[PDB]
């Protein structure tokens, strides 16, 4: 079901290495629905190439547009398990500190802060 489950550490590492070669200015982001989630829909896809100049606040807006949410639906975006200290951080900076050893940046979303 989950991304890490579907691909070998070997395969995830090699995909990231190719995204580096073919999409050198993009951050490779896995975005997954919380296994508990009941309200929000599932994304059309799992793997995202996010432009490296956008801050986390702009990535939250991109995904809420991808989910086609309305303004009073709730949406939380956990990076690397935990809450973000700050949505003003550039995703280039968040990548360099929160990236997995496979080189993806993992995120989960829910309607509740209590995931």
Chain positions contacting ligand K7L, by CB under 6 A: 60, 75-78, 83-84, 87
Beta partners for 93? Answer: none
Of 16-24, 31-39, 56-64, 86-94: span binding Cl ion (CB under 5 A): 16-24
Residue closer to ligand K7L by CB (options 11, 83) is 83
Tokens of 60: 């939250």
Tokens of 104: 């993806």
- Total number of residues that touch Cl ion (CB under 5 A): 2
State the residue number with the nearest CB to ligand K7L.
Answer: 84
Report whether 49 contacts 27 (CB < 8 A).
Answer: yes
Shortest distance, position 56 Cβ to ligand K7L, whole Å:
7
Neighbours of 31 (CB within 10 A): 21
- Cα(52)–Cα(91) distance, rounded to whole angstroms? 6
Q: Which residue has the tokens 């890490």?
A: 4
Shortest distance, position 50 Cβ to ligand K7L, whole Å:
15
What does the per-residue mask of binding to Cl ion show for 17-56, with x meaning CB under 5 A?
------x-x-------------------------------
Identify the sign of the CA torsion 89, 107, 84, 16: negative
Residues that bind Cl ion (CB under 5 A): 23, 25
């Amino acid at each position: 079901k989950t991304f890490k489950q579907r691909r070998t550490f070997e395969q995830r590492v090699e995909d990231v290495r190719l995204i580096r070669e073919q999409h050198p200015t993009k951050i490779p982001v896995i975005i997954e629905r919380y296994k508990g989630e009941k309200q929000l829909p599932v994304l059309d896809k799992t793997k995202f190439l996010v432009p490296d100049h956008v801050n986390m606040s702009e990535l939250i807006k991109i995904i809420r547009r991808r989910l086609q949410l309305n303004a009073n639906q709730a949406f939380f975006l956990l990076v690397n398990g935990h809450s973000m200290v700050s949505v003003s951080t550039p995703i280039s900076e968040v990548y360099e500190s929160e990236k997995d050893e496979d080189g993806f940046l993992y995120m989960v979303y829910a309607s509740q802060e209590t995931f």
